[model samples]
Target: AAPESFDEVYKGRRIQGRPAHEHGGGYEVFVDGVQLHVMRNADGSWISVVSHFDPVPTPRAAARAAVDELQGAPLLPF
Candidate 1:
């Protein structure tokens, strides 16, 4: 589903972005209820990580971007 809004929190910080539909690959990153980063990818999928924006051509890049963004932050178990 398409994201409704770019307003979000990550690592205790507030961040905002242009609404998803407005941008083809725009997304909001959230960490611990705080906004951290907003990224736009060339291929359409976006990486909304708490620390960095790493874009590549495949899913592995997205995964790596998330792990790199974490930079040792513990993953939440839902």
Candidate 2:
């Protein structure tokens, strides 16, 4: 089963996470409304491009890590 979705403002940025509608049973994360690419490892930890070297315990933690890594910088659109 996928992790529960989350939404909140962190470090002045709006962060959100939800079950991805893709083949993989992982979650999708968004920072300031922009999609933040993320992946889940076999150990159940999560990682994102914004903080690639640091794996977090949950998708929400990953989103917050992305926000911290961005440091108020805007996320580029795809």
Candidate 3:
């Protein structure tokens, strides 16, 4: 299932994300509901604002990747 939205806080930053339906196959990652990154695929792999070179499968992985990029940040709300 896709995430409805990100309502969490990470390192004093409110992190949020949603599927980028407009992009067809991408997601808009946000902080405090404000877009901070865009995760998408290129050549059958995943890329995002943090990991623009590496690709991963699954949106959860992408989300986790974003968290990892944030480093020691907690996902807030839910």
User: For this target, which candidate reaches the highest TM-score against the unseen true structure?
Assistant: 2
TM-score of each: 0.33, 0.89, 0.49
Kindly indicate the candidate among 2 and 3 with the higher lDDT: 2
Model 3 poorest 10 in a row by lDDT: 21-30
Clashing pairs in model 1, backbone N/Cα/C closer than 3 A? 9-34, 9-35, 10-31, 10-34, 10-35, 11-31
- Order the numbered candidates by TM-score, best leading: 2, 3, 1
Which ranges of candidate 3 are over 4 A from the true structure? 1-16, 21-26, 42-44, 72-78
Q: Model 3, 1-78: lDDT tens per residue?
A: 344555665555565666663234446665545454555554455566666677876444555567778675543432
What value does the lDDT take at residue 42 in candidate 2? 86
Model 3, C-alpha of 76: deviation from truth (Å): 17
In lDDT terms, which candidate is top?
2
lDDT of candidate model 3 versus the reference? 0.56
lDDT of 2 at 57: 97
Clashes of 1: 6
**Candidate 1: residue 65 Cα off by (Å):** 4.4
